């Protein structure tokens, strides 16, 4: 039978055109009065793939 | 592509010219190799099977205890280390067939037929006719053309008085103009064929 892709990563990660993946940062949906104002600016913007976690995840997101 | 013509014994009328798209194209060798293996490996029946532990007509209780007896521990009578037990990883029914793309098949056909042209093994007969199916006369036909080895006869349509005279020695196997495969040709040494069979080959093979 076919593989089944993960439905936790399809709702969190979208694939770019160069090969990598776009990722949305964390620590954004909670208390903010603890955090500073440089932090809450610099945690709006998306980051890329670290090549450690691209190994074990690659086969799950086989087509999406 | 210039092949002479024979009557039944009369010799060398005008030599038939053939399409250089087909009969002159310098055969690839790996294509013919994989065509032969794909053909001959597609002839298998796959019917063979072996029972295992859940299919051996046995029982499902520990005969012993785990302790007290002092012998090693067993779960059931029938399991692969016993005699009469099941078998681990036996052969199961498969099908072994697979189809190449639709360019290499015609590349194989063209390559084989150009190979047999370049070594002068097509002997084109102007036309074969028997009033009755007499296998002795067909032997005399092959004696007139002086061919001895494993040979092919390619026929046209219902030549029922020329196809009913080929249950000969194994020099001869006979295919009509439609069922010409690869293994029917590569196994043989020479090919006899009529004029019209060449034309109906050049319709399908363009």
């Amino acid at each position: 039978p076919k593989q089944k892709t993960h439905r936790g990563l399809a709702k969190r990660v979208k694939r770019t055109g160069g090969g990598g993946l776009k990722r949305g940062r964390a620590f954004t949906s909670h208390r903010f009065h603890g955090k500073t104002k440089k932090q809450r600016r610099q945690l709006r913007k998306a980051s890329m793939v670290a090549k450690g976690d691209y190994k074990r995840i690659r086969q799950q997101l086989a087509r999406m | 592509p210039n092949v002479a013509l024979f009557k039944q014994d009369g010799t060398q009328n005008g030599e038939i010219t053939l399409n250089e798209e087909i009969f002159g194209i310098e055969p690839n060798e790996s294509v013919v190799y994989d065509a032969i293996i794909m053909q001959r490996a597609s002839l298998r029946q796959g019917t063979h099977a072996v029972k295992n532990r859940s299919a051996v007509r046995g029982g499902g209780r520990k005969p012993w205890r785990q302790k007290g007896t002092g012998r090693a521990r067993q779960g059931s009578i029938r399991s692969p280390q016993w005699r009469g037990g099941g078998v681990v990883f036996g052969p199961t029914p498969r099908s072994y067939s697979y189809k190449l793309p639709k360019k290499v098949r015609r590349l194989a056909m063209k390559s084989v037929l150009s190979d047999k042209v370049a070594e002068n093994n097509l002997v084109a007969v102007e036309g074969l006719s028997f009033d009755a199916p007499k296998t002795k006369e067909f032997k005399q036909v092959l004696a007139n053309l002086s061919i001895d080895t494993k040979v092919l006869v390619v026929l046209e349509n219902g030549n029922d008085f020329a196809a009913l005279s080929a249950r000969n020695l194994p020099n001869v196997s006979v295919v009509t103009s439609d069922n010409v495969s690869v293994l029917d040709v590569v196994s043989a040494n020479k090919v006899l064929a009529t004029q019209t069979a060449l034309t109906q080959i050049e319709e399908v093979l363009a």
Binding site: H6, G8, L9, K11, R12, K14, R23, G24, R25, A26, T28, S29, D53, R56, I57, Q59, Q60 | P27, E29, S30, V32, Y33, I36, D115, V186, S187
Partner: protein, 145 residues
């Protein structure tokens, strides 16, 4: 080449059979080493498991939605047109009909990369704001039908 055969060079490998004696290199535990659940029968954890550490997908947040009525097109840029020399009515038929646009998706859009020197005519369903200028520079005619 007849029945009594050669493969291509490098065309077919052999195999590697595992658990057959201590001088092939894979006898006594079969390339698995000593104990542990990567070395039992059928062991190994599921994919993406990292111990009880919360894995990467339960660490970064869910985001977005999908439109139900997304209508995206079947883009041809501009150089693909540059072999239909003069006067064709480029269209969602005869334009395709040689191996150019199989499977138009919602109608054909045209883009502007990168040089057209003809006098064609185009019938598509959308156009960029530079492809019209590139076509009318070369003297053609366009219509969004």
């Amino acid at each position: 080449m007849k029945l009594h055969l050669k493969p291509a060079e490098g065309s077919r490998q052999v195999r590697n059979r595992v658990g057959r004696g201590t001088s092939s290199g894979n006898g006594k535990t079969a390339g698995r080493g000593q104990k542990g659940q990567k070395a039992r029968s059928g062991g190994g954890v599921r994919l993406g498991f990292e111990g009880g550490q919360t894995p990467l997908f339960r660490r970064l947040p869910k985001r977005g939605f999908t439109n139900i009525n997304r209508k995206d097109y079947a883009v041809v840029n501009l150089d693909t047109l540059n072999r239909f020399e003069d006067g064709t009515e480029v269209t969602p038929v005869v334009l395709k009909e040689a191996g150019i646009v199989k499977n138009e998706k919602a109608g054909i859009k045209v883009l502007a990369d990168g040089e057209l020197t003809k006098k064609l005519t185009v019938k598509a369903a959308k156009f960029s704001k530079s492809a019209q200028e590139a076509i009318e520079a070369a003297g053609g005619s366009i219509e969004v039908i």
